[PDB]
Design a protein around this nucleic acid. Structure first.
Ligand SMILES: [Mg+2]
Ligand SMILES: [Zn+2]
Ligand SMILES: [Zn+2]
Lengths: 229, 519, 97, 107, 51, 168, 84, 58, 171
DNA sequence: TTAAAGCAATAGGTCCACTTGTGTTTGG
DNA sequence: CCAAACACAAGTGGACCGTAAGCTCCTATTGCTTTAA
RNA sequence: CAAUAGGAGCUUAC
């Protein structure tokens, strides 16, 4: 459902790597003291250890990430490719957020885990390619944004957000709001003459171009032939 | 607004309904019967009424009006006549379908050879598409060689029992081979006999083959009266100030009239059967080549210059025909063309426009209470000084040309009036280089007026146009209203096309000396 | 003369979505015309006398249901040639089914 | 279902549709050696029910003729025993969105 | 004259007098009347025997 | 310009002799179809108004539009004035005076009574409320269509009508 | 009959590029035809720029009627669609 | 393509053209149901009646 | 005879008139425009039921001109005569070659040949009028007269009647 | 004896669709 | 095994071949016979 | 306040 000028190549981070690398980047443990958040990044570090009503949410997050890993690896991208054209560029969003709110001095982060998890969940339930309370509308809406949700969940993971990007609450709210608005801006407009645009986008490259290739092969394809060269 | 007031409401065409013209309606919409071939009266000043230049057909002169509608040359559409034929003839563009219907139907009683009794045809009837239904009924009904009177006690379907002929086509003559029971006596099927057979088809029978009761009746595919187009469709021309030759259609109609009269000179006296066929076939050939002069396997109706006649079909087809040469694309006013040049000092969405072109082209700007001082300054300046103006349009359409008007100082601009001022700085204009392979080959630029008759382009936009400065010329189109100005500036503007949907990457970059210099 | 606004220029304007500009190039910058059609038969067989404010399709014997249409003059000429080949193009201003 | 070996003659073939209200379909054994719905290029087809077809048509404000179509002789329609008017749902890989649901109506 | 179609066109041309070398070249020009109806690129090719 | 629900009436190949008017023979024209429609396209029975319903409707509309003009604050020669234009005032004055010179039913009560009693073709339905007739003869001769319907009832209906007819 | 109630309107709440372009053109033509202007006119005299100021301040009095492929339509006032 | 043959077949079968396409609206010089012409622009009354009473028709 | 007729009228409005009390201005424009006009297809539009409560709906801006179109649908009352229908009237004019009678909005004139022959004209009576023994036609009289002809002229129409038939004439 | 007007007269390769003929099945 | 109903293959049909632009140059029916002054 | 058509040929920029 997206306009073709609005998408940029982005890496899907849940796809590549070994299971150990996946586990180290994304899996958090609350009871386990060492494999938890590094204490020197958050205000509430001491309150974290040993909790259960939060390790449940962390496990739910990690299982969603494993679901995305399995889905992308077995259904969508079986050959491992993870650099694909997608809507809003999140690296640029994150770096702009870092620039505006001055994320230096490694300050204690006031951004709690449950707030991160619920923010990403609400965002994933706020990307509207189709609007309507119908049931086929809901199914098509979730099928439309599955890959982009996979990207947003592979990037805005709790360990990554807290350690690698060190965002606070203000930067977090800004990143989420910007993702809503820029995704709403990435959608194709009704009324687009996608057929003429597609025809020109296919024909123009032909002006610059023992397997048959190039213009004769494209002519064979478009002039559907019962036999080919 | 350049059309004189008419009281009917103006609306737009939502539906087009094609179909044949019946002889009754052809006679009805006509305005004068055409029978005399000779163009002029006797070379005698306002030619013979009932000829091909009857003033009832309409006016093609600037100082004469139409005797049918009483309107000037600008408004009169032209008016059709009719010209009854002595014998009916085939429409050249329907002979194959006449042959198909002849094969499908019973050529004696006007009934479909097979009924709904046979379930194959009973389901072939059940196609909604007229063409698919016609194909599915013809692909079955074409082989039964009798009109069985009993549906497969004796129950009669009303049929007759006469055998069917094996239709064949040889030119414009429809042969039908009757294999009696040996020697199959093959006879010629004239247009009149087929017309008589076709008039007998019942409305429901007509529906099954896929025709229409109101719009397309199978006998209207045979011509019995011919419409004569107005002279607008076949205007004369002037070669050296005193001479005129008629258009091809006019001479073709004259030849048809000669053929018709020769036909009417045979059924009135001796005619030993080898002149009736010859002259009726001459009529058939003239009528055929009046509509289609590209008929396979026969000579072409020629001009005495040796060229073939420009038939209507040849008028309608091709790159230069009506559809592709005048409807899909056409020549337009308010355009300019000249060589392009590069200017490092122009902005990306700026184009440098020569002064002479800026004064030749114009934009109509409605007078309002925010631009009245500026427009009156333009009116005083005149059409030879920049910034000036070329025309003033009054609230009823009367033009005030500011060239021949000697008293340019004594014009006060009214509100709601329109001034066709010059081309000025920052006007959005559509700018274009051929070939226009993609949507970014034609983009809207802001105007900057300059001397030195080339067009000026910022050098980063030469990539989407695929242009360079070694001879190239580019076209400039000026929007003549505010809707088109807004459309250009908000959809086609150069800044909006920097990123392309072809490969979701930019198409304009830094090029050709700025790149080397920045390195 | 004027410059040809050919088919590929129309394709580019269609890609841009500029419908008004395309209509304005092909009508007000070129052979725009006005014709009257019969509201019953949909043929351009209407005899119009604008100075006497009187209209009639004599085939349909009609004087009240007549409509005017702004169409390219090349389109009017095309319809007249089609009528010359016995084809009836009927321009209707409202949908039925 | 009548699985045959070599060929089914047209004279015999004409009796197949005239045996209402029962339905007779035929397949050749050579065609059945490979199950084509297991092929990687063949996504999973699921015939809709009448109520779900009505829901599909109403959700898109559609008529039956305005849907993409599938021939009754399509190998996967033939494999699924599709009758005229029944709509399959085809979920398939999408490199831009991950997952995409397609619907085709039977000719 | 009455058989202009089916006759070769362009066998005679207006001598080019724009500059002297243009005249000298026009007086030494050659034309193969293959025609443009046909996309056979073979007869358009510079050939070894052209040396 | 002035159009209505009557739309295409497109041209079939055949014509129809049954297009001329003859009000004696129930031929009125292709504008008064036996089943009308409304401004929502929904089907609706034909309307053939007697002089009473029409007079009441026109009086009602005029006084309603006068109260609308007045912000919310008696004779046809005055009540017709609500229109715009001298020709308008003249035509409505003549119509209203014509109504008050032949209105046998001068109230809504008797109009409602005749509506109930009557509700048969609305043409003759209204013409009975418009044309006073003593016995069966005037109706069956001035309106020749009552013969071939075998539901007459003119005797008692006309009796009660002329009974309900107010003096003058 | 073919109009859609304001609750079940399932089109985008955002003004599209084509709707914006045509709305601006139409408003510019209107103001250039001596129509009343709703915004406070301070400096600018070009009708298109006045139309842009009115569009930004949600003071353009127009309605977009968005036709669906089945002939039905939805009505949106310009002031309730969101402009970027 | 095949302009004359297609028009003859349209005549001989009484085809009804629904005029929903682009090219069809192009040859008639009408606004295509495309881009800027894929909608209509009405006049809003609820917003208009808020204007000052002196900006009124006379 | 008067018929209740649903009818419409498409209109054009300049942008200059785009104010806050527009719809009422269009209502007044409709009332001025339509109250009195004749149309050959309907008859005569005398009044409009519920004039102030007509719905103008939402108008559409015409692309290229900027003027608004309104399909103002409403139900009104129209009066049309038909040949062979009996219509009452009152005489307006008198003349030796017949007399005029005002029917609805119109005026109907009956010719001399279509009048019972017991009726005799008089140029010398005070008041001047047709007479008879047991029949009278003077100014102000009522005439139950049949219509036997109606020509349709767009602005004003005229109907020529005939009082030669039974149950007709002076009443 | 000469001039003007009107009528008549010449000698490139692919693909799709339609028609006809010869083969297969069911069987009198 | 000779018959009807019916299908498939081969051969001979037709239609179309980028876009825009400039200039120059030639031709626009001709010849013979018949009629009228 | 009014500047023919049809053809062929040679060229311009892709
Ligand atoms: Mg170049
Ligand atoms: Zn028969
Ligand atoms: Zn008509």
């Amino acid at each position: 459902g997206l306009d073709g000028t609005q998408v940029e190549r982005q890496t899907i981070d849940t796809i590549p790597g070994s299971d150990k690398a996946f586990h180290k980047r994304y899996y958090v443990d609350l009871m386990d003291e060492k494999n938890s958040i590094k204490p020197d990044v958050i205000e509430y570090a001491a309150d974290i250890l040993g909790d259960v009503e939060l390790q449940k949410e962390l496990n739910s997050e990690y299982e969603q990430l494993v679901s995305d890993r399995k889905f992308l690896r077995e259904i969508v991208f079986v050959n491992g490719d993870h650099n694909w054209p997608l809507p809003v560029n999140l690296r640029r969003i994150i770096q702009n957020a870092q620039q505006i709110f001055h994320l230096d001095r490694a300050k204690a982060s006031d951004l709690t885990i449950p707030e991160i998890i619920h923010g990403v969940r609400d965002l994933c339930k706020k990307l509207f390619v189709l609007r309507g309370e119908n049931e086929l509308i809901k199914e098509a809406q979730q099928n439309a944004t599955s890959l982009f949700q996979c990207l947003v969940r592979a990037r805005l993971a709790t360990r990554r957000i807290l350690e690698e990007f060190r965002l606070n609450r203000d930067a977090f709210e800004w990143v989420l709001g910007t993702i809503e608005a820029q995704f709403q801006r990435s959608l194709v407009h009704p009324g687009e003459m996608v057929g003429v645009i597609a025809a020109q986008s296919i024909g123009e490259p032909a002006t610059q171009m023992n397997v048959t290739l190039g213009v004769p092969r494209l002519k064979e394809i478009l002039n559907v032939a019962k036999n080919i060269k | 607004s350049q059309f004189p007031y008419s009281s009917a409401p103006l609306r737009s065409v939502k539906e087009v309904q094609f179909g044949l013209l019946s002889p009754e309606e052809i006679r009805a919409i006509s305005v004068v019967k055409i029978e005399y071939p000779e163009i002029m009266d006797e070379s005698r000043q306002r030619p013979r009424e009932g000829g091909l230049n009857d003033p009832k057909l309409g006016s093609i002169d600037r100082n004469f009006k139409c005797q049918t509608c009483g309107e000037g040359m600008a408004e009169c559409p032209g008016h059709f006549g009719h010209m009854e034929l002595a014998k009916p003839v085939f429409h050249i563009g329907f002979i194959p379908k006449i042959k198909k219907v002849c094969e499908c139907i019973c050529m004696n009683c006007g009934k479909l050879l097979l009924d709904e009794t046979n379930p194959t045809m009973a389901q072939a009837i059940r196609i909604r598409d007229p063409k698919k239904r016609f194909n599915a009924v013809w692909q079955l009904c074409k082989t039964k060689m009798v009109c069985e009177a009993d549906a497969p006690k004796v129950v009669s379907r009303g049929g007759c029992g006469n055998t069917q002929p094996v239709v064949r086509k040889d030119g414009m003559k429809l042969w039908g081979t009757w294999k009696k029971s040996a020697q199959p006596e093959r006879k010629l099927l004239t247009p009149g006999e087929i017309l008589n057979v076709f008039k007998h088809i019942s409305p429901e029978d007509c529906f099954r083959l896929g025709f229409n009761e109101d719009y397309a009746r199978p006998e209207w595919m045979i011509i019995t009266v011919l419409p004569v187009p107005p002279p607008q469709v076949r205007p004369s021309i002037a070669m050296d100030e005193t001479t005129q030759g008629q258009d091809d259609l006019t001479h073709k109609l004259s030849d048809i009239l000669k053929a018709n009269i020769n036909v009417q000179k045979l059924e009135m006296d001796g005619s030993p059967q080898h002149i009736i066929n010859e002259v009726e076939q001459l009529l058939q050939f003239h009528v055929a080549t009046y509509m289609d002069n590209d008929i396979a396997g026969q000579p072409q109706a020629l001009q005495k210059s040796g060229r073939p006649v420009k038939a209507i079909r040849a008028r309608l087809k091709g790159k230069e025909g009506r559809l592709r040469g005048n409807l899909m694309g056409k020549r337009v006013d308010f355009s300019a063309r000249t060589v392009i040049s590069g200017d490092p000092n122009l902005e990306l969405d700026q184009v440098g426009v020569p002064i002479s072109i800026a004064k030749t082209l114009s934009y109509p700007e409605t007078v309002t209470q925010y631009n009245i001082h500026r427009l009156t300054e333009y009116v005083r300046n005149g059409p030879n000084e920049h910034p000036g103006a070329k025309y003033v349009i009054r609230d009823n359409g009367d033009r005030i040309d500011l060239r021949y008007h000697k008293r340019a100082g004594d014009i006060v601009l009214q509100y709601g009036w329109k001034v066709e001022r010059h081309l000025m700085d920052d006007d959005p204009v559509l700018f274009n280089r051929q070939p226009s392979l993609h949507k970014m080959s034609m983009m809207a630029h802001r105007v900057k007026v300059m001397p030195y008759s080339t067009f000026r382009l910022n050098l980063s936009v030469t990539s989407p146009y695929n242009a360079d400065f070694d001879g190239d010329e580019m076209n400039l189109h000026v929007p003549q209203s505010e809707e088109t100005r807004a459309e250009l500036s908000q959809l086609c503007a150069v800044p909006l096309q920097i990123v392309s949907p072809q490969s979701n990457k930019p198409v304009m970059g830094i090029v050709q000396d700025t790149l080397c210099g920045v390195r | 003369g004027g410059l040809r606004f050919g088919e590929m220029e129309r394709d580019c304007m269609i890609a841009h979505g500029a419908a008004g500009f395309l209509k304005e190039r092909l009508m007000e910058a070129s052979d725009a015309f006005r014709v009257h059609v019969c509201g019953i038969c949909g043929l351009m067989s209407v005899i119009a006398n604008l100075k006497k404010n009187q209209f009639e399709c004599r085939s349909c014997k009609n004087k009240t249901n007549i409509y005017q249409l702004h169409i390219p003059y090349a389109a009017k000429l095309l319809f007249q040639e089609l009528m010359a080949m016995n084809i009836a193009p009927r321009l209707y201003t409202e949908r039925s089914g | 279902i009548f699985i045959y070996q070599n060929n089914i003659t047209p004279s015999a073939n004409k009796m197949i549709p005239t045996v209402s209200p029962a339905i007779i379909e035929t397949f050749q054994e050579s065609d059945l050696v490979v199950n084509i719905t297991h092929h990687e290029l063949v996504p999973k087809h699921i015939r809709l029910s009448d109520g779900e077809k009505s829901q599909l048509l109403q959700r898109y404000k559609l008529k039956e003729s305005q849907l993409p179509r599938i021939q009754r002789e399509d190998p996967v329609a033939r494999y699924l025993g599709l009758k005229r008017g029944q709509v399959v749902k085809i979920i398939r890989r999408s490199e831009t969105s991950g997952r995409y649901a397609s619907y085709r109506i039977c000719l | 004259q009455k058989k202009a179609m089916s006759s070769r066109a362009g066998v005679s041309q207006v001598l080019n007098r724009y500059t002297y070398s243009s005249t000298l070249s026009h007086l030494r020009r050659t034309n193969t009347p293959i025609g443009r109806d046909g996309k056979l690129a073979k007869p358009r090719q510079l050939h070894n025997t052209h040396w | 310009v002035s159009t209505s629900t009557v739309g295409a009436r497109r041209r079939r190949a055949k014509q129809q002799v049954d297009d001329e008017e003859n009000a004696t023979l129930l031929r009125l024209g292709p504008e008064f179809a036996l089943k009308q429609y409304d401004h929502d396209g929904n089907e609706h029975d034909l309307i053939a108004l007697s002089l009473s319903e029409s007079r009441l409707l026109i009086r009602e509309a005029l006084k309603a539009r006068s109260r609308a003009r007045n912000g919310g604050v008696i004779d046809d020669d005055e009540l017709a004035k609500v229109t715009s234009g001298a020709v308008a005032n003249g035509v409505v004055k003549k119509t209203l005076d014509y109504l008050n010179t032949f209105a046998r039913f001068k109230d809504e009560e008797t109009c409602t009574a005749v509506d109930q009693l009557l509700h048969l073709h609305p043409f003759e339905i209204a013409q009975l409320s418009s044309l006073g007739c003593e016995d069966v003869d005037e109706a069956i001769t001035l309106i020749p269509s009552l013969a071939a319907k075998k539901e007459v009832n003119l005797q008692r209906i006309l009796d009660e009508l002329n009974r309900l007819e107010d003096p003058y | 009959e073919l109009a859609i109630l304001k609750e079940e309107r399932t089109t985008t709440p955002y003004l599209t590029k084509y709707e914006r372009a045509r709305i601006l053109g139409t408003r510019a033509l209107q103001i250039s035809m001596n129509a009343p202007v709703l915004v406070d006119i301070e400096g600018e005299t070009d009708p298109l720029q006045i139309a842009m100021k009115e569009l930004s301040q949600r003071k353009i009095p127009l309605v977009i009627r968005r036709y669906l492929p089945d002939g039905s339509y939805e009505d949106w006032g310009c002031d309730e669609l969101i402009v970027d | 393509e095949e302009t004359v043959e297609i028009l003859f077949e349209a005549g001989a079968a009484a085809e009804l053209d629904d005029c929903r396409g682009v090219s069809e609206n192009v040859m008639l010089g009408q606004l295509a149901p495309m881009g800027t012409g894929a909608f209509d622009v009405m006049i809003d009354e609820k917003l208009l009646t808020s204007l000052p009473a002196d900006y009124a028709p006379t | 005879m008067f018929f209740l007729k649903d009818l419409s009228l498409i209109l054009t409005l300049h942008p200059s008139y785009f104010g806050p009390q527009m719809n009422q201005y269009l209502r007044e424009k409709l009332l001025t425009d339509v109250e009195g006009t004749c149309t050959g297809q309907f008859g005569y539009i005398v009044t409009v039921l519920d004039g102030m409560n007509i719905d103008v709906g939402k108008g559409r801006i015409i692309p290229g001109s900027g003027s608004a179109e309104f399909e103002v649908k409403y139900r009104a009352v129209v009066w049309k005569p038909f040949k062979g229908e009996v219509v009452d009237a009152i005489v307006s004019n008198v003349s030796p070659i017949g007399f005029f009678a005002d029917v609805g909005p119109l005026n109907v004139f009956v010719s001399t040949r279509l009048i019972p022959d017991n009726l005799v004209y008089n140029p010398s009576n005070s008041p001047p009028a047709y007479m008879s023994n047991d029949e009278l036609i003077t100014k102000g009289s009522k005439v139950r007269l049949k219509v036997v002809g109606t020509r349709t002229d767009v602005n004003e129409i005229y109907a020529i009647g005939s009082i030669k038939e039974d149950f007709l004439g002076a009443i």
